[model samples]
Target chain A: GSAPPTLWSRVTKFGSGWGFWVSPTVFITTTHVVPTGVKEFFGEPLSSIAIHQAGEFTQFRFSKKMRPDLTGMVLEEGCPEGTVCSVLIKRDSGELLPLAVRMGAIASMRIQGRLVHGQSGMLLGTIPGDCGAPYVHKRGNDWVVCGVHAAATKSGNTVVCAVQAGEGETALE
Target chain B: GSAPPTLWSRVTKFGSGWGFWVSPTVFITTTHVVPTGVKEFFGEPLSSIAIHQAGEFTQFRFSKKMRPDLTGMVLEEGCPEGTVCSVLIKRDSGELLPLAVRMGAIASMRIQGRLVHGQSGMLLGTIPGDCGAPYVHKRGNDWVVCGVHAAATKSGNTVVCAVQAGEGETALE
Candidate 1:
């Protein structure tokens, strides 16, 4: 029972969003999308704007180490092709959206009852950009993760807010 | 050094807007404004548009007992006046604004880091109707309740989301 992963990443602090890769260098989002000192961010325009990794688009030098109640962050290049342990969602962004991948216990009690405590889930209708994205699910064959894109409510409705990765659960670890 | 209790009510499921009485019968608000089987609402015209008790606006006999993570409620009438053990912010609503009463360590770490986990607080400049209002603060003479009005952000910024009362100390209890 050690074969489950699918990674995901993207976050330039709200100006651009999406996150996951649970354990390659640890990056999970939603502590208000990276609160607590917020190391650095002013560049990384999504590889200049979609590069085929070689189709042409360069620029990358971001750093992170936040967590004092910022929900989690500790990157330096860890996942994109490094192998995963317990990851899920892999949207890759292509349009045709309106995603969904909910978990259990009423989606962790509706995200600990709406940011009330802990454990979370949700990605109802018309998602768009999907805030700090990540909503992987697989429960039986492994690959699991269930919340990320935190708060985007009121009509367009999008609220994923959940992060309690293995090794002590979560409080954003 | 013991006397600080004003009282408040009205949340027949977000109709009149306002809730807090921490104890006496319990009532917190902002679990997305009384979410959890939400009994009823569609009336309570604010007693035909605001009044002062005998000023005429009577129609109170609601019910309660939520906590499936609705954030707290148990009402049966308490704290209209019961020797207030502790509580704050009595916005009786007569037209007035811009309230403030913050405290220690990053405004309680930015409202438990944006509803990530609770027992919270916040009310920066310009706040009206203040969603599920209640951001009381005093601490040395009693009157303490630090968090409610959970979320009102995106430029118009106003976030106060904490709720941990009784002994652990939070939200005027």
Candidate 2:
């Protein structure tokens, strides 16, 4: 079977990018995708904003967390190179698109002043609204979040420069 | 976009395996999937049976080919290692399942007295009725058939031992 419908349902459209619920009240996305000066989501005040330990991803916690509705994602560690993965992105028209991709090499590079990790070689190209999309892998029967879509390279290859959800969760707490 | 829905709708469930239309009136699969005494499909008389040049896959032509329904698959040459692919299979309950997989290595091994090629590294497991499932790859805007599922390794990895659709189509002609 595929990922739970509830999990897919939680993939929310935020401004021009995308995000998903990781914990009932916490939404995760690429740091660059968050709109400047944003203060709230779904009418709830932004209680906290945390950057990934690696500095390229972010998490938003709302003042009032949502009730547990089986919608949050399960975080996993590194996605192995050559593994098959799926990226879920919602179109501006509200249509959900699932893309099949192969996990490529993950390399650490210095950007500005912080060292960040970027995963490369995703086979599919992302649209403008795809930043902050979830890079999911199926382990056994469960779909686990492993990376976040950040940008596409000049050659049309995709680059995911976000911390693994497992690592990001620790930093947030 | 995914495979044209019409192409998916053309995946017919054979006796115990699965096959799909490659031409308006011709269906293809692995030779081993054909039942010993079967003589027809969809009420059409079996008109021809052709094996892959390498001798593992087979294609069955019907006496009356259906009208062009935009349901036939476009055959592609090869699925490169590390490429993301999708396998389409139908369950006994008539549910169509599309599996995401990464293409592994393709190697020629001697089987009996014939040299046949097999592709490995698919990430998903197949059930009893999944033999001869179509291994599809998305090329730009089109979904093309590249390989066919033959069996899974004892270690739980998948192996596609059938010929590439592009090669098989030529042999059939």
Candidate 3:
């Protein structure tokens, strides 16, 4: 194996998607947080992880190119091993910031979502226990497991994800 | 078409389903609902709709085969003429018989829903305004609604429900 990369990111969507990098991918993306109630919402049964350079919060669309570093095995093939990803957080003045990173096998993926434009955007990392606690909980007191990696996932361009097992999890719980 | 054949009782397995029936030939279902903060008793998505048919509490699985009479409108295909279809309700228990239906017109569509399994008696049949009104204010008004049923209550051949809607109302006001 090519040293199963540790570099990864965490994300959740308010929908359904799944797909590996390039070949018949099955993951979906959103423009921003829509109406929802997921903790770390990306998409229900998230299938792809998104990969962006550094910061691209305003850009809602994802990249078409897929990289080993940008994709991963997240309880599913779409989000497999070695994927990179990120999330957007709204600032005081309505600005958005990309936050945190997550990698490795995933299970019990539970996300509390947010709603945007009558759609609910989901939550991921907040669920500390499920998905094997991939990211370090910034909101929680003692759960600084991992740090932020990338903050990007839209549609098209690039999408990547992470779980616990490099083998991936079932699409839906 | 050929004379309608006698429908059969069917057993369906849905991860989670919500909504109600219209005419004896149709019903409505959904994947989402307004959440009430409570733990699930059934431990799964709500399933089963009981119809008090001919003085007998009969349950019909909301599937094409289970309730062939149920109009399977993917996109309001066979709803009412102008306003698509409507959800109708004739709330009666024992004395009233067949107390509820899911796919009534908008007015008949009682109850909001929460996707979670179980908790807090949720009844959406009475809107915020109907509170204290006769239909909702009646003290011992046993209400029923359609929404995400409890996943933990009872399973297999037993009736278990989680109120995603229609928890606090009497007869259709």
Candidate 4:
């Protein structure tokens, strides 16, 4: 029951990194990639709000604040195929690696040859530019998402993780 | 940064079974106890949806649905003491016993030497009717809440856990 649907087509919006399709016309990504436009920007700017899939181009925009880190992107064209959103599970240990649930950490595979534990807000151990990757746990026959991968590591043994969506999918209202 | 402010006071609404004060005049509880009034009921319900604190009584009503396992309650009287909400953390292993996150589980302490894992929405490990008990974690300087002690345990090897609030406190609009 904790698996993505068979036809779940995650979009590789190179501009936005990796994201899952929440609706045919709406995909979800970390605001770090999409930039919610909350305030005047100062750092690296967004290149394009355009996202693509299956050889088609579509325009996308971020929704208003749900959380500062999470954002809902509305696509101009619906998804090329039907996709199911991920059923996120809690981040637990005793799995393949030791995971630490910290806020604003990065997502990565290893931290100095050791498994990095990330806080809840951002995943760790994952390298920079790995935004929107699904932090998943393979429970039995399904790969369930725990959080969205976001950000680069800031300090020693840190990978970024995204916020968990227990109430519902983070992208929707 | 992943800590709550001092002077936190979660209301123990014994009648509501288990809940916590979110804002000055709003608290959150499992919809199972508050009963969002989605349909017609038959059993004997409370007279005025009363929630109580230390020695005072307050009238509260349910907010719109968030998750079936959770709901937001609005209190008629803003708490006299500026109450702080709870931020739920995961119950890690090695804490005298193990814990599992199962829904509709019971909350008891040392259920005959066996450890119990509870689910979101309701906590177990404590006995039934033991509502409003804070499932707390003592970090470096503070005691943090993880979940509410919701219902009683049904089987063996199960303790109640709190609902997951990954970002910050849950139940605010």
- Candidate of highest TM-score: 2
Comparing 3 and 4 by lDDT, which wins? Answer: 4
Q: Model 4 lDDT vs. the true structure?
A: 0.33
**How do the residues B1-173 of candidate 4 rate in per-residue lDDT, one tens digit apiece?**
33333323343343445555544334545433544543322232345234432211222433432223323322222111112332232222212221223222111112223322222221224344444444444445644444554433343222333343211111110
Q: Write model 4 residue lDDT over A1-173, tens digit each, in one string.
A: 43433313443343444555543334555545554443322221234233332211122433332123323332221110111223232222212222333222111112223322222231224444456554444445644444454434343232334443222111111
lDDT of 1 by residue, B83-145 (tens): 112223334454434254222111122232332223221233434344556555434654455
Report clashes for each candidate as comma-separated counts.
Answer: 6, 0, 123, 52
Displacement of residue B136 (Cα, Å) in model 3 is 18
Q: How accurate is candidate 3 locally (lDDT)?
A: 0.23
State every prediction's TM-score relative to the real structure. Answer: 0.24, 0.45, 0.20, 0.26
Report RMSD (Å) for each prediction in the order shown: 18.9, 16.2, 19.7, 17.9
For model 1 chain A, where is the 10-residue window of minimal lDDT? A50-59
**Candidate 3 residue runs with Cα over 4 Å from true position:** A1-96, A99-134, A139-143, A146-161, A166-173, B1-19, B22-24, B28-173
lDDT of 3 by residue, A1-173 (tens): 11112321323322221111212232223222223444332332212334322111111123333233453332222232222323333233433344333222221221223211110111222221111112223212221222221212221121122321222111112
| Per-residue accuracy of model 3 over B32-139 as CA lDDT, tens digit each | 322245333124233333322211011233323434444432222111101111112122221111211111111111122222221112121322211111111111
lDDT of 2 by residue, B1-173 (tens): 56667767767776568787887767777666777776755666555533343445676665566636655658755465567787887787877788887764343333334444555444646775688888888788778886667665443444454665332211211
Recovered fraction of real interface contacts per model: 0.00, 0.00, 0.00, 0.00
Model 4 Cα displacement at A109 (Å)? 25
Model 1 CA lDDT for position B34: 40
